Structure 1
Amino acid sequence: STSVKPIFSRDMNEAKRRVRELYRAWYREVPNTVHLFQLDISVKQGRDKVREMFKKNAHITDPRVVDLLVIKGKMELEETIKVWKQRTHVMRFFHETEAPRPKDFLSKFYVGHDP
C-alpha cells in the first residue's frame, strides 16, 4: 500500500540535495533580478525573502511533496531569469500594500468576528 511511484527523489536525503541546489540558484539570481527588473529593494532583502519561502515549508517530510515544491520553484526561476515575469510579479512576494493585519485576540475582537 505504502509502495508508491516516486517523482525524482527516492528518499528525503536525495530530495534535500535538490532543495539545497535550488537555494544556490536562487541566491545567485537575486543580484541580477534586482538589477534587471530595476527593483528598489536590496539584495539582502531579496535573499532574506528566498530564505523565508524555504523556511515556510521547513516541516515537510514526504520525499514526493518536496520534489513537487522543488519543481514549482524551478519553474519560478525560469520565469524570473527569462524575464517572463514583470516587476509586479516579483514584488508580490513582499506584500507591500497589504497593511499589517492584527494577530492578537483583542485586536481581532475589536475589528471583527473572525478567529
Structure 2
Amino acid sequence: VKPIFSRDMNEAKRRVRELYRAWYREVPNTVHLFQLDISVKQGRDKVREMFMKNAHVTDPRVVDLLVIKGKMELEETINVWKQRTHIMRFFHETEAPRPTDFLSKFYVGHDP
C-alpha cells in the first residue's frame, strides 16, 4: 500500500479537521454570496452531516481521497463555480420524505 497523503489514520484525521475548519468558516460567506435563504447554523449543520456520513471510514487512503474531494467541493463553493442550485442540492428540499419503517414501505410499494 502506498499512502495518498497520510501514512496513518491520525494524520488523515488532522487533514479532515483542517477541511472541517475551512468549511465551517466558509459557510457564512456562502450564505451571503449565493443569497441562500438558509441560516448559517443550518449550513454548518449540513456540513457536519456530510462529514458524519463518512465517519465510519477506517482506511487512511479512503479518508485522504475523501478530503481531496471535499477540498475540491470547497474550492467550487469558494468560487462561484457551483450555482445556488448546486449548493442547495445538499438540502433535498424537492424530494419528499421516504418512510423507513417496514409497514410504510409495505404500504407504499414493492421496494425492499
Give the alignment's TM-score, normalised by structure 2.
0.99
Q: What do the CA deviations read for 1:55-98 (whole angstroms, capped 9, x no partner)?
A: 01111110000000000000001101011100000000000000
Pairing 1:1-115 to 2, within 5 Å after superposition? 4-115=1-112
Gaps of 5+ in 2: none
Displacement of 1:111 after TM fit? 1.0
| Distance across 1 between alignment mates of 2:14 and 2:37 | 32
2:89 is paired with a residue of what secondary structure? helix
| Distance across 2 between alignment mates of 1:89 and 1:73 | 14
| Distance across 1 between alignment mates of 2:104 and 2:62 | 36
| Distance across 1 between alignment mates of 2:108 and 2:50 | 29
1:83 is paired with a residue of what secondary structure? coil
| Distance across 1 between alignment mates of 2:41 and 2:35 | 15
| Distance across 1 between alignment mates of 2:74 and 2:96 | 28
Give the alignment's TM-score, normalised by structure 1.
0.96
Flag as ranges the 4+ runs of structure 1 deviating above 4 A.
none
Q: CA RMSD in A?
A: 0.5
Q: What do the CA deviations read for 1:24-67 (whole angstroms, capped 9, x no partner)?
A: 00000000000000000000000000000110111111000000
| Distance across 2 between alignment mates of 1:57 and 1:78 | 20
| Distance across 1 between alignment mates of 2:9 and 2:27 | 27
1:97 is paired with a residue of what secondary structure? coil
